[PDB]
Amino acid sequence: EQTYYDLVKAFMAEIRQYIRELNLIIKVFREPFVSNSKLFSANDVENIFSRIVDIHELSVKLLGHIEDTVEMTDEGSPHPLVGSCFEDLAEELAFDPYESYARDILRPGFHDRFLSQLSKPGAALYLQSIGEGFKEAVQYVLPRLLLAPVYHCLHYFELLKQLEEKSEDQEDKECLKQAITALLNVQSGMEKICSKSLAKRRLSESAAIKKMNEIQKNIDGWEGKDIGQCCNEFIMEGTLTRVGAKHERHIFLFDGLMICCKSNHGQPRLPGASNAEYRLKEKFFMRKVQINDKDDTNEYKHAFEIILKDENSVIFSAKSAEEKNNWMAALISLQYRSTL
């Protein structure tokens, strides 16, 4: 249902957002490691960010060519012919950096080595000195952002196929076929790397308000306005333990609300009473700080602290470090949404 031109328009918007993400990664997250030569060697940086810089250069070059092509496209053509933009680059093996990148970032021991780099002497303190939120963003959000190049390059393979099938110009079609061919090595190479179980789980990990109303409907004792009257999207739904509370609360995370409920699944109700599976306990408005907490003999491990306006802090605990990571990823992203 999409024309060749729609795909190109969609792609230009995608690569512009992507380029912005690469910039964020380079100027905001990576620059501080590069700046502290004493704490991180060239390799340390290399082991975390890989070919990120080359990929950024390739991307700006790709978008630039595509932009000129479009502007220089007269009414004589059925659609701008971008086949050549891709073919010229693929012929110079310009996409090779992505295979190397994917290999470095999706290696099985990536995260462990990443953490060791953040926990070695003076590292955590240096990251905190960069500014509020940097240490948390680096630890729980950066590893997700670092996957962006993989998603982006994988989509290229699919994009080129669709363009080839939809091209209305024989010369353009030919260029596309050639680009596809010249990229077969990079593709099978990335394919092997991405199909391994761990990588596959990681990629899957970071991959109509009917749901919002369906969720409120199933929550008893609602307070304040509707979910739709302050939220625009649904982020997460998991389980956590409130340090101090008696029962593990089920939680619905929206961009505007973190709803903490109690599960009454299967428990008896009086006739005429609500049949909703959950009971509202805490309704938190997302527009305040989020702090990380170290494990405590207090039985609470994999915990973090939420700080509300003029309210008392609340501490939650997750079932594992993996669960805590998913929550901090979403929560930290929400707190610094303006930057991210």
Round to whole Å and give the CA distance between 278 and 221: 9
CA distances, 274 to each of 136, 222, 280 (Å): 40, 12, 12
Residues of the chain with CATH 1.20.900.10: 1-211
Strand partners, 238: 251
Multiple choice CATH, 1-211, 3.40.50.300, 3.30.930.10, 2.60.40.10, 1.20.900.10: 1.20.900.10
Taking 3-state DSSP, the helix, strand and coil percentages for the chain, each rounded to the nearest 5, stand at 55, 15, 30
- Asked if 58 contacts 97 with a C-beta cutoff of 8 angstroms, the reply is yes
Q: Kindly give the interhelix angle for 148-166 and 4-23, rounded to the nearest 10 degrees.
A: 160
Residues 6+ apart with CB under 8 A from 169: 77, 78, 79, 81, 83
Residues of the chain with CATH 2.30.29.30: 213-340
Round to whole Å and give the CA distance between 39 and 138: 16
Chain breaks in the chain (C to N over 2.5 A) after: 207
Burial 21-52, CB ≥16 within 10 A → b, else e: bbebbbebbbebbeebeebbeeebbebbbbbb
Q: Structure solved using which method? A: X-ray
Q: Which CATH class is domain 213-340?
A: mainly beta
